[PDB]
Design a protein that fits this description.
Oligomer: homodimer
Number of strands of chain A: 0
PDB class: de novo protein
Shape of chain A: elongated
Entry title: Crystal structure of de novo designed protein, SEWN0.1
Chains A, B: De novo designed protein, SEWN0.1
Number of domains of chain A: 1
Assembly: dimeric
Distance between the termini of chain A: 39 Å
Largest sheet of chain A: none
Helix content of chain A: over 70%
Order of helices and strands of chain A: HHHH
Keywords: binder, G protein, DE novo protein
Chain lengths: ~80, ~80
């Protein structure tokens, strides 16, 4: 994961158009989210507690990724419990 | 919720066949689960932390209900994160 993000950011800085820069930054975001999906597969609640560890590894892009993963998983749970009611 | 469970247990003790007893005990279980679905709609993580409060209100039947709700929601999350990987 970490090595893949560095290559993506190596490509984003090399780029001179905002389309390519955003493309590679989104590749980096999606790679980080894959790391979080694996942690949440084993323990979703611990995932919601590891925001600090993700920020240490991935910086602000890690915050962005964590926020999206967390948000989409609570939207799934919301829909789930509305159905059960 | 609490009043509905008491009526269900009023019916279960009045019954003399194990089919009716189990039916009313399951009605009580399902009513308790409706209370938990509403708490988890607002905050699923707090739901996983309220086991003690459910036991105080509903006793062993509350433990049974909490265990089923918790188990089925982690099975949903497991399937969810497997898809995302």
């Amino acid at each position: 994961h970490k090595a893949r993000v560095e290559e993506y950011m190596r490509r984003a800085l090399q780029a001179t158009t905002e389309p390519e820069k955003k493309y590679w930054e989104e590749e980096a975001k999606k790679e980080i989210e894959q790391a979080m999906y694996a942690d949440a597969l084993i323990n979703p609640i611990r995932f919601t507690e590891k925001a600090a560890k993700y920020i240490k590894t991935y910086g602000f892009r890690g915050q962005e990724a964590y926020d999206q993963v967390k948000k989409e998983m609570f939207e799934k749970l919301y829909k789930y419990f509305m159905e059960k009611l």
